[PDB]
Design a protein around this nucleic acid. Sequence first.
DNA 1: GCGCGTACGTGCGTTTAAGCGGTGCTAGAGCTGTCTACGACCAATTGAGCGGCCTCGGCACCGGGATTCTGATATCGCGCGTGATCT
Length: 51
Amino acid sequence: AKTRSSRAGLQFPVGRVHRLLRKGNYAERVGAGAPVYLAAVLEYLTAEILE
DNA sequence: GCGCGTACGTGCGTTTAAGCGGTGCTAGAGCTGTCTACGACCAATTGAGCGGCCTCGGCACCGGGATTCTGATATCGCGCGTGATCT
């Protein structure tokens, strides 16, 4: 699978989250797992609200 | 506004443990050196996401109907008071 969400088994965009973390002036560098973790958390909260 | 009653406040006595000074021990926070692997950066490219258009059906509108339901009165039942009868 190409998309990083598919690798992480998520419906939210890991690539977009990584890009925002980088172009958000949050830190000099952004780990590889931070976008995955944040996408998973956002997906969980979205599902929790939508249920 | 009035009246009650009781529950905090003020004060004195007793008790507890906070506080201060002192010494000891070591746990971990900080610093230093070294090294590796993770991420930024770059290039290529292709595919996921977005804009737009179309179809359709979920829901907003309107009309008619069922359903509470809120308030009063009144009827009926129950309770209290007064009158009549019996003991």
